[PDB]
Amino acid sequence: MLSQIAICIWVESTAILQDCQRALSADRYQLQVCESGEMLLEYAQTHRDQIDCLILVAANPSFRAVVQQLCFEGVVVPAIVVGDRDSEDPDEPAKEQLYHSAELHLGIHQLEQLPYQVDAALAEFLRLAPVETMA
User: Which residues make beta-bridge pairs with 53?
Assistant: First the structure.
């Protein structure tokens, strides 16, 4: 039944899009690229359950707003976030508030763990389901 995994990434930079998909290149990965953040919502708006893993880049400005739309529509998926740091300083509130509590974080220079992260993000999404999409 697993057949293939559906993953939709949101990235305005092709290099980032190729790097994110590069890691998630498994023959069972269906990567969808969204030129905007609103375009990403339209894709999930009809595949929330069909999506197996969402990729996001915190480097975006209103990106938090786009993620809130997914939570707002009720679209919750094992989403992996990029552009995250381990800085404990409050200057950069980089918490899970970007998306639901199941979201996983990936290092910007660590583009390659997406697949292992996707498998982990999937298990994390089920154990945390129903996840809390505070948005």
Answer: 7
Residue of 103, 100, 104, 98 lying closest to 132 (CA atoms): 100
Experimental method: NMR
**Token pair recorded at residue 58:** 């915190």
CATH superfamily of 1-135: Response regulator (3.40.50.2300)
Q: DSSP letter at 127? A: H
Determine contact, residues 56/82, Cβ cutoff 8 Å: yes
Distance separating alpha carbons of residues 67 and 35, to the nearest angstrom:
15
> Order of strands across the sheet with 5-10?
29-34, 5-10, 53-57, 79-82, 104-106
66 phi/psi in degrees, rounded to 5: -60, -45
Helix, strand, or coil (residue 104):
strand
Q: Report d(CA 13, CA 102) in Å as an integer.
A: 25
